[model samples]
Target chain A: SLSLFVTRLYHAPLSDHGPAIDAEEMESSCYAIAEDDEAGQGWCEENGYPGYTSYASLTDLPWRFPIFADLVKSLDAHVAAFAEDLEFDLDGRALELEDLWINILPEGGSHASHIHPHSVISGTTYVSMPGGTSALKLEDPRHAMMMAAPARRKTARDELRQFIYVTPAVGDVLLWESWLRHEVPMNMSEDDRISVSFNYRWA
Target chain B: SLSLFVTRLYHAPLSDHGPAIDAEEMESSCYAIAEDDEAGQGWCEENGYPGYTSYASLTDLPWRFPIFADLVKSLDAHVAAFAEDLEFDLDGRALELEDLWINILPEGGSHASHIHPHSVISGTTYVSMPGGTSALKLEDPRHAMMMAAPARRKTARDELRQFIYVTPAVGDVLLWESWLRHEVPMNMSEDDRISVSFNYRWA
Candidate 1:
């Protein structure tokens, strides 16, 4: 039998807000982006910086401009096609999207291990990256559950459970459940790395 | 503004090794499906007969039968498409098709108001229906939440606000949250009504 895998298509409008910032501006000004915790602390453990946060209720963000709006519309249509493939009715239920933001990770910057709490689904779209900048890591929630059983000792193989890590490449989008714990390895490349992340909720 | 929606698909294989009953036998032996609570008892108020039930596991089920195996495969594909549309990463989440059963309601036989509590998702496909079958009623969960507010005052609409009903035609499949309260109205036609119901859960 073939191993089962899951992924979804994502799109956003083109960015015309301003000229792309270089490493100097990205490292300092990028810190203005939204933080997950109330205190605005960086979510990434290393030198990472967050920028450009948006919520579902805020419809006037720069990302929603015509080009970005058109891209989102295309993605919406693609998702609808997938729904029809599964024979799902979309009459009354609603889905909400939020947190349109960018991340600028300098050399040695890395993300912490955490899950998106407010969304039923979440994903990231790589915008720009230098070779070997960072890698996305996926963890198995079942391992944590199994470890909760006091009598069951974890074996060496259990400790080394296989994980999926995707290197940052332009135009690449990674999708997964918001509840799955994930992290980004420290950026080892000299060039600056940029990416956008968003969350979706069903209402 | 565009609206966002999410859909999920599920399927269950028929049980094997158990007493295999033909459609005619099932029609004669199956009781009217029951509603979940006492308030829903009104649907069964006059009907005195109990309902019949069955469970199926794919491994134990006779997959050699083309019809049964095809149904299971088709459902698996449907669920995959659904997951993709919703951007859900199964992440080692396995789905097991747990049970397949039929319900028969004769003249004046009706199911009561109830919710499927055992499964995260439950659904029914109509095989046959005669005229005079009452509509399926759905209760709004939000109505109850609003009523729970301490400062809310009683109003005339409050009593009727909780109920909504839909009349499903033959060949149509209706899906909703498993926790949503629903019930089948009384069957007043001379012919009997038949439907297949199934439950699915994370394996």
Candidate 2:
């Protein structure tokens, strides 16, 4: 009666259903990796990227860090649960963890718009989110087709608006279909914005 | 050989297949409404919301405004096209526009994370975008469940990151399944940000 073709976004504590992960420790490892991943730093500079992204620099942080390895194991279970909630009849195939990395966005840093083109499920776990820092901004993926539409009333219900802003607490893991367009707006605070993002492909 | 359940976000210009919409007029009308809607101003104040949203106080904008009526007539066609691209089988039904409204986000304004609770298709079209403003951030719907997942390597491909940001230009329309979680990060620019957002339900 209200809506159709609905997409679902999932959120849960990292430790609720999977192995326990310490947020402080997670932040420690994220920073450690960033400080050491000189290649990533160099790549960020080359691309004029605002902050450190291990996306182009390293792919085996889990292999190198035992903590990351543990994180992946837990995420595997979490994805399984989410898939169930989605009621996806995967034809016996399962979503598998594809790639993972660290994001350390310094003050005034921001990641522009993009989507996970090929992966089935993609998400992030917050490692560090300073108070009053910017939250994750998600575009209404369908805005591309909203031709000549009138704007929703300023007091329109949240579900009725075009853009959505979500602020995840530290240690929270969020997931969505791979193609949902999303981005991190600029971090205005003086501290850094740190998080780990990942992808899961159907296997 | 990996991944299933991919989601696609659609993008296109308003003039692609609809009647012309004067962006300048839309902006003017939006501002006029904001300045005139004293009830909305009170609502924003009571709620501590940053900007003027016609959501709570207005329900008959299309009825009152000819431009909005024309805008919706065009959006109906655009949404119909998008529904086809999504390959949704309506079972002898069709998606219909439900609610439309205006968003006047002032400098330093922001809309936080959430999803359309009950609509099927939701979206927004830009009316006015000042330079140096923030983009829409979409979270992976599955982020809540990624308990132990490591973040994507910053060097990961575009499609691999957990969160995505999309910035639509003026005269552009974007559409997505209603359940996609998204948000508008704070507006850092000095000028006001104006846009129209809407929702469509299955009929």
Candidate 3:
């Protein structure tokens, strides 16, 4: 009769807490960085990544770009708000920015299922989600123990299903616990699906 | 990378720890009880249960049958062993048997997915499982937050998949935390699937 151990997800516009961020400028900035960061392109190519990602090549996007710095400011506020909502006891500490990266997934590109370890909170902000692009797919964190369980119905209620898809609009932000498993299915759109993902650690 | 937050399941033979009970006698006793317990019959009929279940009508099976009493003794030992394996701190108290009941699922009968609330540990001991019958299905507990996640590949590793199907054999016992969600799919074999389920609560 009661639901227990409920997981929470925080969703909001980037403008909700910090200074306004221009969507067009953010998208353009992603492309500018992707086009200029030859190391990132090389890393993606070496790793067989379907598209450009600043994940392995860049570690100081916020310091290198004013727009990224502004985005982190907004993400910090959002993560703090989410921490409060999650009732985390931080022992007089704050959740500090750990890493921030840009993803420019082209058509047919996808990200595999994974979790962000060594961090407390993780999230993404949509920069460019073209029509027919892949939606972010989140998996149940307890997936490892579900031995021999049947797949939930395709029509299962959103909260009851094993997997969930969310297609956020440009400028929209989504946050969840770092342990949550997530991925991006192949992008079907001819255009790219761009986003900025980041993690927060206790500091 | 290390796998964090690993969930554990307990599996063993019922005779692993305590006095032995005759399997044939146990099966016969199930049918005998079902034939004589008119209240259970009426309840099943009223609820459209495909088979009889002593769940709602009987709470004293161990007292009424010596075999069941012996079975409970075995179960108590098994539960204690599982409790140790689970590393549960009982604050110096023990887990006591809260309830025990019989399930006689006939052909086409199914039990819906559910969690056992208000119990510390819950499990089932199989008495009979005919060929082609349904298996026990256990689901990921953090299903509510997986908005927009894709299903795991059909050939996903057992521990990585979202759902797992475990077909326990006769006299085999499976124990898990009370909060784990599980269900029994429909019985396809003409023969009935018989099982005894129980719950333990902290004393």
Instruction: Write down the lDDT of every candidate, Cα atoms only.
Output: 0.51, 0.81, 0.78
Candidate 3 lDDT tens digits, A144-197: 544323233445344445566777888889998887888988898888889999
What is the DockQ score of candidate 2, to 2 decimals?
0.04
For lDDT, candidate 2 versus 3, the one ahead is: 2
lDDT of 1 by residue, B1-203 (tens): 55333222222222222222344443333332223223334433444443322332123222534444444454444444444554655578755555555566667767777877445455675546678445466665544444334433345343334565555665444545466677888776777677766555543
Instruction: Estimate, for each residue in A1-203, the C-alpha lDDT of model 2 and write its tens digit.
Output: 56877677888888877677887877888888888888888899787677889988899878989999899988898888998988888997789888898888887576756677558889998888786644778777566445445567878876777777888888888998887878787786888888889999885
Q: What's the CA error at residue B184 for candidate 2, in Å?
A: 0.7
lDDT tens digits, residue span B72-91, model 2:
98898889899999899989
For candidate 2, what is the TM-score?
0.53
Residue-level lDDT of model 1, residues A74-133, one tens digit each, is: 334433443444354446864456555556666777777888965655777565678753
Instruction: Calculate the i-RMS of every candidate, to one decimal place.
Output: 15.8, 11.8, 15.1
What is candidate 3's lDDT per residue for B91-152, written digit by digit as tens?
66777888999999888888889987678789899999898544688776655543323233
Q: Where is the poorest 10-residue window by lDDT in model 1 chain B?
A: B53-62
Native contacts recovered by model 2: 0.00
Off by over 4 Å in 2: A1-203
Chain A alone, TM-score for each of the models?
A: 0.59, 0.95, 0.95
Candidate 1 residue pairs that clash: A13-A68, A95-B4, B15-B56, B31-B51, B31-B52, B36-B114, B40-B113
